Amino acid sequence: MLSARHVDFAYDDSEQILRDISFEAQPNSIIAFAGPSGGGKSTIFSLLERFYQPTAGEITIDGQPIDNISLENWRSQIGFVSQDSAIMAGTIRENLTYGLEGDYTDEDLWQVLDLAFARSFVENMPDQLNTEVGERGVKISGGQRQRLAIARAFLRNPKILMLDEATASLDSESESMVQKALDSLMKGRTTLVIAHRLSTIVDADKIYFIEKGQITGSGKHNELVATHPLYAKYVSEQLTVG
Ligand X SMILES: Nc1ncnc2c1ncn2[C@@H]1O[C@H](COP(=O)(O)OP(=O)(O)OP(=O)(O)O)[C@@H](O)[C@H]1O
Ligand Y SMILES: Nc1ncnc2c1ncn2[C@@H]1O[C@H](COP(=O)(O)OP(=O)(O)O)[C@@H](O)[C@H]1O
The one of ligand X, a copy of itself, Mg ion, none whose footprint includes residue 194, by CB under 5 to 8 A per kind, is: ligand X
**Closest CB to ligand X among residues 184, 216:** 216
Cα 32 to Cα 163: distance, rounded to the nearest angstrom: 9
Which residues neighbour 233 within 8 Å (Cβ) at sequence distance 6 or greater?
none
Closest CB 130 distance from ligand X, rounded Å: 9
As a whole number of angstroms, the longest Cα–Cα distance in the chain is: 57
Q: Can you state the angle between helices 106-116 and 142-156, rounded to 10 degrees?
A: 120
Contact flag: residue 88 with a copy of itself (CB under 8 A): yes
Contact flag: residue 114 with a copy of itself (CB under 8 A): yes
Binder of ligand Y out of 4, 30, 31, 40 (CB under 6 A): 40
The one of ligand X, ligand Y, Mg ion, none whose footprint includes residue 142, by CB under 5 to 8 A per kind, is: none
Binder of ligand X out of 4, 7, 17, 122 (CB under 6 A): 17
Closest CB 102 distance from ligand X, rounded Å: 25
Answer for the pair 53, 47: CB distance below 8 angstroms, yes or no. Answer: yes
Cα 59 to Cα 91: distance, rounded to the nearest angstrom: 37
Closest CB 214 distance from a copy of itself, rounded Å: 13
From the centroid of its chain, how far is CA 63? Answer: 22
Answer for the pair 44, 21: CB distance below 8 angstroms, yes or no. Answer: yes
Q: Which residues here bind ligand Y, judged by CB under 6 A?
A: 11-12, 14-15, 17, 35, 37-43
